[PDB]
Every structure is written in structure tokens, then in C-alpha cells.
């Protein structure tokens, strides 16, 4: 599925990720549209040789298990294509586990590059939540 924003927005707002680990909504939905530019069903090959997977992007060297990516984990407990529904809520319980884990959002390198120290709340501009 393709989120609109401010459907996507609510969702992550539903799922409790504004301010989780004291990050704001905009960030999510940030990171969300240059990971997957809001696409569930978006997959992207790593140089590693490992996976992203879904609207946030969650790599399979650590998170999710996709069968393919040598001397990986499954931190998430989860198939990877459980990441690519139009139900983001496997997505969301894993990137809570993700930025819980010390770096915080830095573990996602398009919101270190492209979120970071943005006007975030642009993102939810608009969006009745
Ligand atoms: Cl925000
Ligand atoms: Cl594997
Ligand atoms: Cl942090």
C-alpha cells in the first residue's frame, strides 16, 4: 500500500511512536518518506548483501528473517515480508526495538542524512491527529 501522509501520520501516532524514545511523529513520517516514500511494499538490496523491507526500511542483517542474508539475525522475530503489509503494525513493534537499541534514529541513515535537525513538523502539517 501507498500511505498518504497524514494517514500514515495517524497510524504511527495509533501504533504510540510519537515520541517514542522522545522522537517526535514528523521524524517517523520523515524517515518513512525517504526510506520507502511511503510504500509498504518497498524492498531495497543492501551492498552487505542483506535487505530493507517496508515502510521504514528494516534491514534483514539484524531485524527480520528473509532466509538470505548469511550470519543474520531475526532481533524482530518476524518473516521480512511480514514488514511489507498494508498493516504496519510488525513494522512499527520492530522500530521500536530499533530505537531503543543506543543510536536511536541514526540506525536509519536516511533520517541521519535527510531528517535530522529538519523541520520534522512539516511532515505532519496539515494532518488532523
Ligand atoms: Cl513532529
Ligand atoms: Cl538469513
Ligand atoms: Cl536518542
Known amino acids: 500500500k501507498v500511505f498518504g501522509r497524514c494517514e500514515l501520520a495517524a497510524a504511527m501516532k495509533r501504533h504510540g511512536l510519537?515520541?517514542?524514545?522522545?522522537?517526535?511523529?514528523?521524524?517517523?513520517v520523515c524517515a518513512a518518506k525517504f526510506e520507502?516514500?511511503?510504500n509498504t511494499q518497498a524492498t531495497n538490496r543492501n551492498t552487505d548483501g542483506s535487505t530493507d523491507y517496508g515502510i521504514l526500511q528494516i534491514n534483514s542483517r539484524w531485524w527480520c528473517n528473509d532466509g538470505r542474508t548469511p550470519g543474520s539475525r531475526n532481533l524482530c522475530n518476524i518473516?521480512?515480508?511480514?514488514?511489507?503489509?498494508?498493516?504496519?503494525?510488525?513494522?512499527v513493534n520492530c522500530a521500536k526495538?530499533?530505537?531503543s537499541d543506543g543510536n536511536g534514529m541514526n540506525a536509519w541513515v536516511a533520517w541521519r542524512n535527510r531528517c535530522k535537525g529538519t523541520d520534522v513538523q512539516a511532515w505532519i502539517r496539515g494532518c488532523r491527529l
Open 79 to 91: 518473516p521480512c515480508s511480514a514488514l511489507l503489509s498494508s498493516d504496519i503494525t510488525a513494522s
Open 97 to 99: 526495538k530499533i530505537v
Open 18 to 28: 510519537d515520541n517514542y524514545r522522545g522522537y517526535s511523529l514528523g521524524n517517523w
Open 36 to 38: 520507502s516514500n511511503f
